[PDB]
Design a binder for this molecule. Structure first.
Ligand SMILES: Cc1ccc(-c2noc([C@H]3C[C@@H](O)CN3)n2)cc1F
Length: 330
């Protein structure tokens, strides 16, 4: 089997991407944030505290004839930005772009943090990291990809995120028309439950490539590119007037600047992020100071190849017995 679904930026800045998902019988379609950095499928629901719902589409398990309460199961998760959600668990039928999983754990939110409440366009998350990270207690549950992959034509999914434009998540096949040149595959460590890999280095603009190992994760659920402070300093030094701001919380730059590209290495291959992918617009409405899309990972503990990097590539998440990651230019 295979599946294919369009993913869409939630706003003009590509702050995140939503993908329609069919849950239950009859189908309840919710727009979920596909997140290769976590492993919970959770949704706004009829159980979510009323005051914490503001515009989201909710899942109502009582109206699904295939929904079953998972007795005694709860979940609770916190994301890298301090955001959180929690609730109970159902099993139900879940379909993505024509690919169907029966008995998928659907985690129904009772509580969500303010950031989720304030984003009316995101109805929940669909985790695509490794199932070892799933938070359901006392019995851990499997991800959508994990449940589907034995049925897939090939145990893979691909992320093809667009710059200010729609893109595609495919399951079970590689669309050879979606990229240029070849796909370069690189080793993955699953020891922390992430799609963790090691970049071979970077360049800034037309500058010479610096060969250096950068361990990080491929994370569709993170907006920006987070890299070591040395690397990030080298990038923003090439932008006149750019500075790291304490009050703002990272590098900002004059909105009139022309941003240089950023290149990262995948083995001997090179993925080039165009400079305008790194522009995240005025820090506040009407400001001439803009937020940078490359930021330091120093306070995080790990480097994160978020959407800023991934959207410059066609990315293969290969879930064979020994998982690997593939990158192609497009
Ligand atoms: C309001 C909001 C906040 C965070 C997230 C979010 N989704 O994926 C992630 C990254 C960071 C780490 O969790 C691994 N994946 N963060 C989504 C939101 F809609």
């Amino acid at each position: 089997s295979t599946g294919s679904a369009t993913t869409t930026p939630i706003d003009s800045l590509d702050d995140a991407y939503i993908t329609p998902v069919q849950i239950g019988t009859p189908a309840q379609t919710l727009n979920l944030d596909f997140d290769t950095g976590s492993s919970d499928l959770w949704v706004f629901s009829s159980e979510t505290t009323a005051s914490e719902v503001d515009g989201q589409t909710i899942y109502t398990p009582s109206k699904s004839t295939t929904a079953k309460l998972l007795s005694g199961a709860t979940w609770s998760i916190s994301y890298g930005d301090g955001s959180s959600s929690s609730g109970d668990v159902y099993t139900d039928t879940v379909s993505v772009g024509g690919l169907t999983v029966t008995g998928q754990a659907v985690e129904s939110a009772k509580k969500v943090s303010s950031s989720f409440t304030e984003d009316s366009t995101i109805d929940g998350l669909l985790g695509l990291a490794f199932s070892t990270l799933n938070t359901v207690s006392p019995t851990q549950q499997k991800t959508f990809f994990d449940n589907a992959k034995a049925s897939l034509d090939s145990p893979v999914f691909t992320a093809d995120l667009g710059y200010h434009a729609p893109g595609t998540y495919n399951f079970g096949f590689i669309d050879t028309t979606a990229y240029t040149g070849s796909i370069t595959y690189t080793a993955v460590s699953t020891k922390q439950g992430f799609w963790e890999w090691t970049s071979t280095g970077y360049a800034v603009g037309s500058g010479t490539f610096k060969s250096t190992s950068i361990d990080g994760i491929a994370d569709t659920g993170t907006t920006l590119l987070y890299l070591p402070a040395t690397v990030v300093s080298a990038y923003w030094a090439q932008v006149s007037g750019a500075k790291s701001s304490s009050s703002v919380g990272g590098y900002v730059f004059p909105c009139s600047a022309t941003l240089p590209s950023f290149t990262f290495g995948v083995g001997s291959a090179r993925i080039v992020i165009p400079g305008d992918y790194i522009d995240f617009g005025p820090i506040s409405t009407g400001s001439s100071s803009c937020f940078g899309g490359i930021q330091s990972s120093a306070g995080i503990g790990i480097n994160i190849f978020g959407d800023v990097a991934l959207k410059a590539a066609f990315v293969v998440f290969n879930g064979a017995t020994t998982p690997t990651l593939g990158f192609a230019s497009k």
